[PDB]
């Protein structure tokens, strides 16, 4: 169906096909069994032009999958800085919790993406956020030996 092809086009970077499918009436918010939408998959794989096209054509920036994961979580975790910026400009919830209680800031701190941590903090990320395992983003930075991120989070918390 058109929704399956759009999910495939979005994860595979098929800019032209994404536009063809949405012209042929594909649902921009098509969700698979797992709650994943085209915007999740484009945000995950770093397809900036597709993220922009999907947002322009009504994609839900705050869509969550079965694990509470939002496009912003995926872009923050996967190190896609320009996508993080575009998703926040479109109204992404900077402090969304997934089903582990992790925020985008937790996942950027864990995965070692320092400029993404700085942009999240600039857009109101909650430095004190605790996941369900009792960890703050600072704790995950420390745990993962991300000393630059730990230093920036300690300053933000002051």
């Amino acid at each position: 169906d058109l929704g399956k092809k759009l999910l495939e086009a979005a994860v595979d970077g098929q800019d032209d096909e994404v536009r063809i499918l949405m012209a042929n009436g594909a649902d921009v918010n098509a969700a698979d069994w797992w709650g994943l939408t085209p915007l999740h998959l484009a945000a995950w794989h770093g397809h900036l032009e597709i993220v922009e096209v999907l947002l322009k054509t009504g994609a839900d920036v705050n869509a969550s999958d079965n694990n509470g994961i939002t496009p912003l979580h995926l872009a923050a975790a996967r190190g896609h800085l320009e996508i993080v910026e575009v998703l926040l400009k479109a109204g992404a919830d900077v402090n969304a919790r997934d089903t582990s209680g992790d925020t985008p800031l937790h996942l950027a701190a864990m995965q070692g993406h320092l400029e993404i941590v700085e942009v999240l903090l600039k857009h109101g990320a909650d430095v004190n956020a605790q996941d369900k395992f009792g960890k703050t983003p600072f704790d995950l930075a420390i745990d993962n030996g991300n000393e630059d991120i730990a230093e920036v989070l300690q300053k933000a918390a002051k």
């Binding site: 999910l7 994860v11 794989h45 994961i69 975790a77 997934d98 864990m110």
Partner: peptide, 22 residues
């Protein structure tokens, strides 16, 4: 396809699912 427990668990779960259809 190994099961990562604790912080990042939700992320790793979704990251693995996306890895299937990728």
């Amino acid at each position: 396809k190994s099961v990562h427990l604790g912080p990042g668990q939700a992320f790793y779960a979704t990251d693995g699912i996306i890895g299937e259809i990728r």
